Amino acid sequence: DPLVATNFGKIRGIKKELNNEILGPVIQFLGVPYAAPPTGERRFQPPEPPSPWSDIRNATQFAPVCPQNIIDRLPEVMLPVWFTNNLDVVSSYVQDQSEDCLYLNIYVPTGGPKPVMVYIHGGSYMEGTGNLYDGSVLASYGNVIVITVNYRLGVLGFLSTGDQAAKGNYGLLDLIQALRWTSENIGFFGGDPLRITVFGSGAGGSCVNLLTLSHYSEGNRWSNSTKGLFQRAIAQSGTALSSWAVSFQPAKYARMLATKVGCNVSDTVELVECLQKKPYKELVDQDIQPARYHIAFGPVIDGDVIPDDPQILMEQGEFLNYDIMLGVNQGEGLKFVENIVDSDDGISASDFDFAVSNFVDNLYGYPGKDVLRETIKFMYTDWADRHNPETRRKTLLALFTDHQWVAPAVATADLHSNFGSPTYFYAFYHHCQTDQVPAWADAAHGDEVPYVLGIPMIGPTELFPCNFSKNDVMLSAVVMTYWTNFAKTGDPNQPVAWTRYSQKDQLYLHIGLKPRVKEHYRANKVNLWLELVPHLH
Amino acid sequence: DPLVATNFGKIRGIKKELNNEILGPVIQFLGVPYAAPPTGERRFQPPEPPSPWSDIRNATQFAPVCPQNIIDRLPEVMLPVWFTNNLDVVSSYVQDQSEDCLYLNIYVPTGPKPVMVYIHGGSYMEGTGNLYDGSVLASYGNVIVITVNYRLGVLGFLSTGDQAAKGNYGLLDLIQALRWTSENIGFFGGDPLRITVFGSGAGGSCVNLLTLSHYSEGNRWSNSTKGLFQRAIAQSGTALSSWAVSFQPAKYARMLATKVGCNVSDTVELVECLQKKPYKELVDQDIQPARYHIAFGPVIDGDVIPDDPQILMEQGEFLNYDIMLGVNQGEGLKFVENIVDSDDGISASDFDFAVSNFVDNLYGYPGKDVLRETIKFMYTDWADRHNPETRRKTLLALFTDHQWVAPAVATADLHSNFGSPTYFYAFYHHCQTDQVPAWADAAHGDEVPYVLGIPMIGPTELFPCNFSKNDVMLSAVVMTYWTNFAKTGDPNQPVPVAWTRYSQKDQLYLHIGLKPRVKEHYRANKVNLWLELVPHL
Ligand SMILES: *[C@@H]1O[C@H](CO)[C@@H](O)[C@H](O)[C@H]1NC(C)=O
Ligand SMILES: *[C@@H]1O[C@H](CO)[C@@H](O)[C@H](O)[C@H]1NC(C)=O
């Protein structure tokens, strides 16, 4: 049997055969505590280390996930499509909940310590679990250790009063704790604590980026030369600079919740103490909605974990030199457009104007809006066929995609390479059409996930039920190789050459069935939001 | 010897051998009167027909050109570069002047042939058809070529805003030449029902303006074809540009009247006063308009020009001619030439100044702040935003696009829209002179020597460039397109790389270079800025 001794006790994993000939087996350690349960007085408090246990602890089944409610209005626009498309399956992964949810899962392959890829999930900061992301194939195919983590979500993980009463960022601190646990225990599993790659998609991608800006991710016990906890980062369709990356009005929504559950909101210490006497179910189940493209509960600017606005930090180059790799998908903004399209696959010029105008209002309140609505309306029309209704959606979809994902990604990519971090950029332009998605839709938000995890190798799963072709399998194998090569050496080419990114040339890898390296991804539309729109104010 | 009988008498031309083996000889009839001298009481009056002569009139030397002053200064930005580059040679063509200058030149090769009437023009102020030798074009193409001299500057376009001086005398002269041609060219072996008019620059403007005038309607030969001429080619010139037509004619008529001592309350007295003065005195007065506008030119008289060409075009008020338009890569050379430093680049400093003054001259604030920023963004290549060699290339494009390209596309669009067989091109080659920078591309008027077939003869006093073997080949191709178009209204058919018909939807055009290809939507990104965005602002 597979036994492993850790600094808190011995644990037993479980061997797992994969449904493919090319793939060797993996031992998976499910439900490994990396922190003390954040219950009672430790709610709204930094994570403490886990209690040691005397005997052998079985790590063979998922632990209950962190409190969340996806069955009872959720922001489809932030959430991956494969998530919202089959919530029924996703729900079975989230049924068993508990405030005691700080657990991570290890996937170990089968003559030196292996790289460790720690996955950080995330949709809107409100929900999800690392359990959804099976790390078996990636570990086996890549010959690396893969870890998935569960961190505090929503209220419990990010509620803040704007005071020392509740400073917030408990979720990010949990991630820090999981990374420290990993740093100081993964070696016992045959992992290399000095080649740890952190990677995540969506809000998970945001979390990855936010950590690189935090001084809590500085320093590791093993090396005086390498002062990072983790050494590399991959942020997939997520950044720290988007409108919904961090919560800017945390005290507002903390008051709201406290009110809704009947707690006095005058004194902040009294407010917090009251919330702590209430079930997590009651706090989670309250209806708290922010602005359309903003969040209520998430990462906050506390002057500690996150010392300042991520924008300012990046500009001042306030981050350790990590090997970075970030990118976006062709059509992230599917769910922004999906409700608008009619029986034929197009949107009228009428609906177009409404959508673009409301977009301007939500993200750019008039101080001057008139000018802006026209500049954008112009920029996101293809005059080649200005009356085509099928082309109007593709470009409207591009508006959301560019502003919410692409421009933030490029800005991030630019500033990292600018300050000396080996940066790599990509554009994911393939996917596997499900019977739940339109036939005209391209690579949407989160569609790159199943390729990174190697799902096509195993074939359709309950979570990813698409009929993966042979092209899907090959593309997946290519992706996993880039990722894992990057994990092994900080170079996606060293275990089509993926060239290093730089602000001048802005070379990136266009990922498709025919992967090529291009240059200046959508710079025309990008520089609009980074150079023009700001100067108009 | 070559004798020809016309409705006004017999005339003797002169045979001319061309300096190329492939070219047969041509008989050229130089100094043929097509109208009575507009002298004395016929100054500021429509052109009357020429007097008949009993004997043989020798047409073997150029007649004196229309009054003009380039020696005493010259709007370099409107004028072709080959013009301003060697004024010494150009001057020899303009030395001998006379108000009696309504003469045209015939070039006959060796059924009835097509007739190509060339309409010269720089700023409406100067020039002559004599500069444009039509020998090679006629010989190579096997068509008759005509060059015309029409009234210029004050004498040709002065208007008081009254019936006292209605203006457009120059345009009426062109009409007179065309009527003369229609009713006499048959005697030379020409086809009065296959007359093509073509011109570059202001000449191009003149071509376009004629298509909007009802005076070019009706011919004596056919009841089905309602046009005097049947086809039109407008090279780097339109009726929609800022300097195509004079909108403040009365202002500048008074200015002149003032300088010569004729400023009178009553316009009929004013005109009568100007009529008692030498043409030299009127031509030599210093009258300069706004930076990108004209003082003396085509005017909106409600007769010859029934309304603003823009309105006319939009309402489709024009006969359906076979149309052909295009521009050169870098028309706006002379806009930028003064700015470049020893290195072939312009600083970010000078750039902002040049662009801002451009905004002020063409778009005086009534809102300018927004506009200068929108433009500054659109005309910078963010690929390398700091490159000084690239800053000039894009600033040059600003002028080029606004003054030439956008007016051309708009014209091209509205013509094809209302049913005229339209054709579009972009001229991307030239022959670098020791007078032009080595970094300059196809500038204003650089397509002329290729249209006239000069590379076939080799360097001339006017076109002294060392034409290569490729130049000769490209010229043959250009002349073939032009002459095919004259013959059949189709640049692909001589009788009775395929250049595809243009249309507002597909907007196919011929990219003319050493490797001529058909592309689509020429600089539509930059065009639609001026046609769709800035207006709505
Ligand atoms: C732990 O699990 C293994 C297999 O998963 C099993 O053999 C063992 O008996 C379990 N231990 C306990 C104490 O239940
Ligand atoms: C025209 O030229 C002929 C010879 O070609 C000559 O006899 C005649 O005198 C000339 N005409 C005039 C008006 O000089």
Numbering used by the authors:
A (entry chain A): 52 to 123, 125 to 162, 187 to 443, 445 to 572, 590 to 631
B (entry chain B): 52 to 123, 125 to 162, 188 to 443, 445 to 574, 590 to 630
What does the primary publication say about this deposited structure?
Members of the presynaptic neurexin (NRX) and postsynaptic neuroligin (NL) transmembrane protein families form the axis of a signaling pathway that is crucial for the formation and function of excitatory and inhibitory synapses throughout the brain. MDGA proteins bind NLs and control their function and interaction with NRXs via unknown mechanisms. MDGA proteins are attached to the postsynaptic membrane via a C-terminal GPI anchor, and their large (∼900 amino acids) extracellular domain consists of six immunoglobulin-like domains (Ig1-6), a fibronectin type III-like (FnIII7) domain, and a memprin, A5, mu (MAM8) domain. The extracellular region of the NLs contains a cholinesterase-like domain that forms a stable interaction with the α/β-NRX1-3 LNS6 (laminin, NRX, sex-hormone-binding globulin) domain (Araç et al., 2007, Chen et al., 2008, Fabrichny et al., 2007).
Simultaneously, the insertion point for SSB in NL1 is in close proximity to the Site I interface (Koehnke et al., 2010), suggesting that presence of SSB might affect MDGA binding. Next, we determined the crystal structure of human NL1 containing SSB (hNL1(+B)) at 2.55 Å. The nine-residue SSB (NRWSNSTKG), inserted between Gly295 and Leu305, was clearly visible in the electron density; the N-linked glycan at Asn300, a modulator of the NL-NRX interaction (Chih et al., 2006, Comoletti et al., 2003), was, however, not fully resolved due to conformational flexibility. Superposition of NL1(+B) and NL1-MDGA1 (0.308 Å RMSD over 434 NL1 Cα positions) or NL1-NRX1 (0.306 Å RMSD over 428 NL1 Cα positions) structures revealed that SSB is spatially immediately adjacent to both Site I interfaces. We found, using SPR, that insertion of SSB weakened the NL1-MDGA1-2 interaction ∼7-fold, while reducing the NL1-β-NRX1(±4) interaction less than 2-fold. We propose that this differential effect is due to the much larger molecular footprint of MDGA and the resulting close proximity of the MDGA Ig5 and Ig6 domains to the N-linked glycan at Asn300, suggesting that SSB reduces the NL-MDGA interaction due to steric hindrance. Indeed, removal of the N-linked glycan (Asn300Gln mutant) partially recovered the NL1-MDGA1-2 interaction affinity, whereas it had almost no effect on the NL1-β-NRX1(±4) interaction. Taken together, our results suggest that, despite the proximity of SSB to the Site I interface, its presence does not eliminate the ability of MDGA to block NL-NRX signaling. Rather, SSB provides a way to fine-tune the NL1-MDGA1-2 interaction at excitatory synapses.
